[PDB]
Each structure stands twice: as structure tokens, then as C-alpha cells.
Design a protein around this ligand. Sequence first.
Ligand SMILES: Cc1cc2nc3c(=O)[nH]c(=O)nc-3n(C[C@H](O)[C@H](O)[C@H](O)COP(=O)(O)O)c2cc1C
Ligand SMILES: Cc1cc2nc3c(=O)[nH]c(=O)nc-3n(C[C@H](O)[C@H](O)[C@H](O)COP(=O)(O)O)c2cc1C
Ligand SMILES: O=S(=O)(O)c1ccc(/N=N/c2c(O)ccc3ccccc23)c2ccccc12
Ligand SMILES: O=S(=O)(O)c1ccc(/N=N/c2c(O)ccc3ccccc23)c2ccccc12
Ligand SMILES: [Ca+2]
Ligand SMILES: [K+]
Ligand SMILES: [K+]
Lengths: 210, 210
Amino acid sequence: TKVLFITANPNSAEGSFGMAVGEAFIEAYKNEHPQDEVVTIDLFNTTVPAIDADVFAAWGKFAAGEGFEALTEVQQQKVAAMNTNLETFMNADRYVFVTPMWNFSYPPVVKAYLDNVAIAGKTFKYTENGPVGLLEGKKALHIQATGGVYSEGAYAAVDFGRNHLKTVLGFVGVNDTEYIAVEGMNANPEKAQEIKEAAIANARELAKRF
Amino acid sequence: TKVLFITANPNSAEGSFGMAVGEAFIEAYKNEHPQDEVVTIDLFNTTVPAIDADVFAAWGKFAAGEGFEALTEVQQQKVAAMNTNLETFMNADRYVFVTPMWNFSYPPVVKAYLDNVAIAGKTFKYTENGPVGLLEGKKALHIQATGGVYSEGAYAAVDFGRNHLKTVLGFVGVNDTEYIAVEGMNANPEKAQEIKEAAIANARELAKRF
Ligand SMILES: Cc1cc2nc3c(=O)[nH]c(=O)nc-3n(C[C@H](O)[C@H](O)[C@H](O)COP(=O)(O)O)c2cc1C
Ligand SMILES: Cc1cc2nc3c(=O)[nH]c(=O)nc-3n(C[C@H](O)[C@H](O)[C@H](O)COP(=O)(O)O)c2cc1C
Ligand SMILES: O=S(=O)(O)c1ccc(/N=N/c2c(O)ccc3ccccc23)c2ccccc12
Ligand SMILES: O=S(=O)(O)c1ccc(/N=N/c2c(O)ccc3ccccc23)c2ccccc12
Ligand SMILES: [Ca+2]
Ligand SMILES: [K+]
Ligand SMILES: [K+]
């Protein structure tokens, strides 16, 4: 089994609630499955090209059935990085995403990564009734840390990071998703440590059945 | 009246349905108010720093009450671009955003932009019972181009770019908003020219009352 541990937090497990929880998850997981390969993708230190005029131009050459040498140097560099990211995603069996909630959503590089990974003909295809995913046999976990509480109730409707990430994963075929919220630390700073510990314990149990 | 024309499309009006609608809106608007100042902010051609370890470190210094020169040169460049974006936004009276739908949301740079503009003490404050916007006297328009149809009914639940943008604007005090969908082109390519013209007329009418 190949696992991607995809993190989008500028802070380490020492200074981030999500990363402490994701770290506890991924280490309990390796312990349970010492023969599994686990690759960390730190999105703040990975090249994750934004879809821009260069990518659109590169795509036009490929659609025009042209080769890689028709691209400029920067287009080449952009496409080769997008290709790597796509190919690593497609080949792994399990995905762990760790995000903080910023302004009701995830950090911008998460959308940039999703844009690398959701590709027609590769991870989804067009159907008589509309798009369907191509990826089969995958499972995903989203661990999200949030100042307030959005995991259930009325505030769930503004949890855009979680809701959008789950939608795109389902769109590419990854309908088997798990969710861990590390929530309420800013609404109750007195309970932050126990909130963290409870989610850590939640993650370590999840590791035994993921 | 200062208008911000905030575009997130790699094509200009020539190859983007949203840009053709947004450009028509802006021309009709200038005809009605020749004295208004419209400033273009092309997010594909503007420095919009992502919040990262540098930014978190800079903010840590500002919180310690250190000065600008206690920052590394990299931190100063990111912070200076962030403050320029925040100040330009705070000072304008009108916002017109134009975005494509990519994978059920907007381009990543829109999230990076929102993260520069939603700042505690500047565009919102904490109160007893919840965060509150600080911006008054503002109006926004969102023009969104989408391949499918999401503006009403069931599929509105996955129109995450639209929904998130509205949420963040509302959080910062901009509750007076207008929305224009340019939708269904991909689902109905024989209708793309009619869809575009109908949406253009929709924009020209709004331009007279916006
Ligand atoms: C830039 C920024 C934006 C934030 N926006 C929200 C928000 O919209 N809603 C919320 O409940 N908390 C918000 N928070 C609080 C964080 O979600 C909370 O600190 C969380 O623990 C961050 O995750 P981490 O500890 O793994 O970094 C924000 C924090 C930052 C730094
Ligand atoms: C990378 C990419 C992703 C897209 N994702 C979606 C999508 O999730 N849902 C949809 O209805 N259309 C999607 N589309 C189609 C566009 O929304 C549609 O072509 C729209 O016109 C683009 O806006 P524009 O013409 O102003 O550039 C996508 C197009 C591209 C190029
Ligand atoms: O790093 S901090 O833990 O100090 C921190 C916490 C919350 C922060 N913002 N929180 C909220 C926010 O930005 C918006 C809505 C919220 C609703 C409920 C609870 C919290 C929030 C924040 C913003 C900038 C820098 C550091 C921040
Ligand atoms: O440039 S195109 O106008 O031909 C174009 C149209 C739709 C495209 N659609 N992508 C979709 C997509 O990524 C997800 C959901 C969709 C639902 C309905 C219709 C389209 C989509 C697309 C994707 C990549 C490059 C060019 C694209
Ligand atoms: Ca549990
Ligand atoms: K480790
Ligand atoms: K643009």
C-alpha cells in the first residue's frame, strides 16, 4: 500500500494543531503497517504550478497534437511539475490531507494541488449524464484544524475547505473519505490542550482501521 | 467612487466568457460614470503573497512590536505586497470580481487575494458574540463563468467559488452584493453565443444601477 501524506500548513507538528494530529495519525499508521510506503508531500515546499496562460498555451499545443519541444522552457517546467504531481497522486492507494481553516477555507496551494490532480482523461472522464471519476480502490482522510466549531450544525454550511475537498475527491473517484476535525481551540482556549489530545486519540484509533 | 476590477482569468475578453461579460459591464459602467476611477487588478499579473512561514514569522515580529526592518528581505517583500493589496481594497468603494469555475471553485489566486484582504483590526474585528465586518459603504459584483449550470436548484450546493466568495465578503462587511452567472456553455455548446449575449445584456443593465 502507497500512502501520500499531503500537508498544507506552514508550521510543523510542534506549532500546529492539525499537524500534531496528522503526525500522530501517520505514525500510528506506519507502526500498524511497517511494510507500507508513505511519501510526504509538503505543499508549502513542493512545486505546484497554478493553471495560467503558460499552461493553457501548453495544453493547446498538446491538443494540436504537438510534442514537448514545442513548449517554451517555462511551459516545459510547469507541465513537468504538473505531470509529476498527477502521476504520484494517481499511483498512491491512500491520501491524508492536513489543513488549517483560513477565512472559511483551506490555504490556496490546496486548490492549486487539486487543479494538478483533477485531469480529464486521467482522473475523470465525460459521460452521457456527466463527469465520472476514473480512480478506483482509493481511500482518503481529511484532518482539519479550525478556530470555531463547524463539523455539524448550521455552521457546517460555511465549512468550505472540507466540503470542497470532499467534492473534488468524490469527483475523481475517491468516494471513501474520512474526516477528523480538531476544532474549537480559539472559541475555548482553556480547552485547547484537551481538544488536541482527544483528536490525537481519535487519529490513533483511526490508524488501526484505515 | 473608486471601483476595483479584480480579474482571475488567464485569457482576456477574447478567449474567456467571464472576461467578455466583465469587460462589457466595465464599459457600460464608465459610460454612466465618466468621472469614476476604475483600477484593474489582474490577479494573474499582481503579486499576491500566500500566507506562509515567512508571513507567520513577520506577523510574529509585528506582534512582538518589532519594526519592518526586523524582517528578512523576503518577508518585507511579501508583507509590502500584502499591505498594498489590503489598502487598495479597503479604500475602494466597489468591487467587481470575475472568475471561471475550475473544479467547482475559483482559481487559487482568489483565495490568496481573500487571505490578503481579510485582516483583523483592518477589515473585521472580534466582538463578544462573534467576528464582525469593519467595511461600510461598499458594494460588490461577482461575475462567474461556468461550463455547467449551478446558479439555482440542487447543483447550487457545489458552487463553492461563488458561495465562499460571498461568505468572505459578508464577513468583512460587504453585504450588498450582486451575482451574474455566465453558465451552461459547455453543457450546451450550440447555445454558447446566446448565453454570452444574454449575460452581456444582463451586465449592461446592472451597470446602470450599480
Ligand atoms: C489567516 C488565518 C485565518 C483564519 N480563519 C479562520 C476562520 O475563517 N474560521 C475559524 O474558525 N478559524 C480561523 N482561523 C483560526 C485557525 O483555523 C486555527 O488557528 C487553527 O488551529 C489553525 O490550524 P493549525 O493549528 O493546524 O495551524 C484562522 C487563522 C489564521 C491564521
Ligand atoms: C481547469 C478547468 C476546470 C474546469 N472545471 C469545471 C467545473 O468544475 N465545473 C464546470 O461546470 N465547468 C468547469 N470548467 C469549464 C469552465 O468553467 C468554462 O469553460 C468557463 O467558460 C470558463 O470560464 P471562462 O470562459 O471565462 O474562462 C473547467 C474548465 C477548466 C479549463
Ligand atoms: O495564530 S492564532 O492562533 O493566534 C490565530 C487564531 C485565529 C485567527 N482568526 N480567527 C478567526 C477568523 O479569522 C475568522 C472567523 C472566526 C470564527 C470563529 C473563531 C475564529 C475565527 C487568526 C488570524 C490571524 C493570525 C492568527 C490567528
Ligand atoms: O477549454 S474548454 O472550454 O474546451 C474546457 C471546457 C470544459 C472543461 N470542463 N471541465 C469540467 C471539470 O473539470 C469538472 C466538472 C465539469 C462539469 C461540467 C462541464 C465541465 C466540467 C475543461 C477542462 C479542462 C480544459 C478545458 C476545458
Ligand atoms: Ca472517531
Ligand atoms: K514524522
Ligand atoms: K486575470
